């Protein structure tokens, strides 16, 4: 709607003011990094390295694995014996978790993400999966909102101008994005003023 | 006698079947006299893969199968060896004393030994 | 015909058991004679009652020269 | 269901390949003879020199 129009319109103005402010900030930020990374140079320059060389061992390497590489550049294909490494025994799969001693309550809800990620190895999940998570979240997904975000200054200015062009707009705009749904947080921020 | 082998892999792949020079263990070269003796030596010592037989229509057949299970693990101080780091005391490090949980394993109690070694030939 | 896989599989066991052959023919874990199902071997009994063991026929005439 | 890890993890196995190859070159245990080489036994004491390890210590630097 014209909501998005006013969004970008007020965006431009807030952006201009804050732009001059923040470009000064960026300057200071470059300076921050400057001294910090300078310190890092300093400690780099106060310690030694022992650089790397190729294999020189001439013992126990007859008839086994070797690796090589091609190029779209006038260079030879270079074959080198391909070292192998002492395996380590792994351990099964865990997805971490929290200890606890007495049962616990959580009244979980709708489109809470960690939006599922079954894989992209075997049919890119099951076609039915779309309807699966759509069923779960009733067609609601995190960040499915038309605009990018909801931030206080933009929130406030938009509420003010929407009134200039409480609830007839508050409830509707809350319906637009999943930040609130109803004007509950909207009227909260209204009471902040 | 005669001896034929049959390498099996994925149940339906290249056999490259076999022949035998003597009546011996083709791995360990031991001279087991009988069929029964050979087969038990073969199942038990070289257990890493698996042995079937009709023995043959022509008294030679054996089927071999790369074993899936095997349990080919270390068997010692389960700790301080299986994940002692790739440094000095990785696998062995048995240099000084080290503990274990008190374990207990009793391998035979007392056996039921039948004179005929064939029982294996039946089932 | 993916022979490479087949070969890379059987290659481990074969390699191992060759190695253990070339040990135990020298430095055995245990005896194949004592082993039951190889009862064929070392034809013998529960014979001797022996304690007076000395037969001491070691004349030993060895000498030096030069 | 379960595999379990094989202690021989193809960092050991190439020191089976190499000396086996060196042996089929030198003394030809498999080629120039039976699968067996000889008796192998009468020597009794110099046998340990071929291969690297017909026998080595667990513990070369020891208490007693």
């Amino acid at each position: 709607k014209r909501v998005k129009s006013e969004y970008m319109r007020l965006r431009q103005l807030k952006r201009f003011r804050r732009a001059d402010e923040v470009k000064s900030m960026f300057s200071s930020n470059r300076q921050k990094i400057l001294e910090r990374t300078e310190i890092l140079n300093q400690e780099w320059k106060q310690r030694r390295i022992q650089p790397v060389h190729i294999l020189t061992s001439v013992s126990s390497l007859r008839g086994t694995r070797e690796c090589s590489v091609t190029s779209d550049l006038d260079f030879p294909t270079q074959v080198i014996p391909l070292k192998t490494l002492n395996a380590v025994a792994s351990v099964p799969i865990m997805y971490s978790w929290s200890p606890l001693q007495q049962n616990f309550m959580v009244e979980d809800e709708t489109v809470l993400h960690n939006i599922p990620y079954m894989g992209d190895e075997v049919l890119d999940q099951d076609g039915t999966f779309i309807e699966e998570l759509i069923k779960n979240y009733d067609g609601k997904v995190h960040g499915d909102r038309e605009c990018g975000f909801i931030n206080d200054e933009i929130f406030v200015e938009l509420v003010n101008a929407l009134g200039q062009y409480s609830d007839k707009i508050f409830e509707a705009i809350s319906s637009m994005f999943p930040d609130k749904g109803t004007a509950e947080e909207l009227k909260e921020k209204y009471k902040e003023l | 006698l005669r001896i034929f082998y049959q390498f099996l892999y994925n149940n339906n792949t290249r056999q490259q079947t076999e022949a035998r020079d003597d009546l011996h263990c083709p791995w360990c070269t031991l001279n087991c006299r009988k069929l029964y003796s050979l087969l038990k030596h073969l199942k038990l010592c070289h257990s890493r893969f698996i042995f079937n037989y009709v023995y043959h229509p022509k008294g030679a057949r054996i089927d071999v199968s790369i074993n899936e299970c095997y349990d080919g693990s270390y068997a010692g101080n389960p700790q301080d060896i299986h994940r002692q780091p790739g440094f000095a005391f990785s696998r062995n490090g048995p240099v000084k004393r080290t503990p274990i949980t008190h374990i207990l394993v009793c391998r035979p109690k007392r056996t039921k030994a039948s004179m005929s070694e064939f029982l294996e030939s039946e089932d | 015909a993916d022979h490479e896989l087949f070969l890379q599989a059987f290659e481990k066991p074969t390699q191992i058991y060759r190695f253990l052959r070339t040990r135990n023919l020298i430095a055995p874990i245990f005896l194949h004679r004592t082993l039951t199902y190889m009862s064929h071997r070392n034809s013998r009994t529960n014979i001797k009652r022996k304690t007076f063991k000395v037969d001491d026929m070691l004349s030993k005439v060895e000498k030096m020269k030069g | 269901e379960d595999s379990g890890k094989i202690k021989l993890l193809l960092h050991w196995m190439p020191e089976d390949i190499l000396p086996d190859v060196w042996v089929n070159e030198s003394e030809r245990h498999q080629l120039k003879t039976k699968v067996v080489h000889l008796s192998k036994l009468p020597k009794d004491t110099a046998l340990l020199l071929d291969p690297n390890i017909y026998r080595t210590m667990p513990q070369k630097r020891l208490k007693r």
Binding site: - | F4, Q16, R20 | - | L31
Partner: peptide, 27 residues
């Protein structure tokens, strides 16, 4: 049934220090 158990000894030595026309004709 051709190809004696020397096939085993073309599994251990696949390449080098090999010969006789059976170690190579054993597969």
């Amino acid at each position: 049934p051709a190809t004696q158990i020397s096939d085993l000894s073309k599994r251990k030595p696949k390449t080098e220090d090999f010969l006789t026309f059976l170690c190579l004709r054993g597969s």
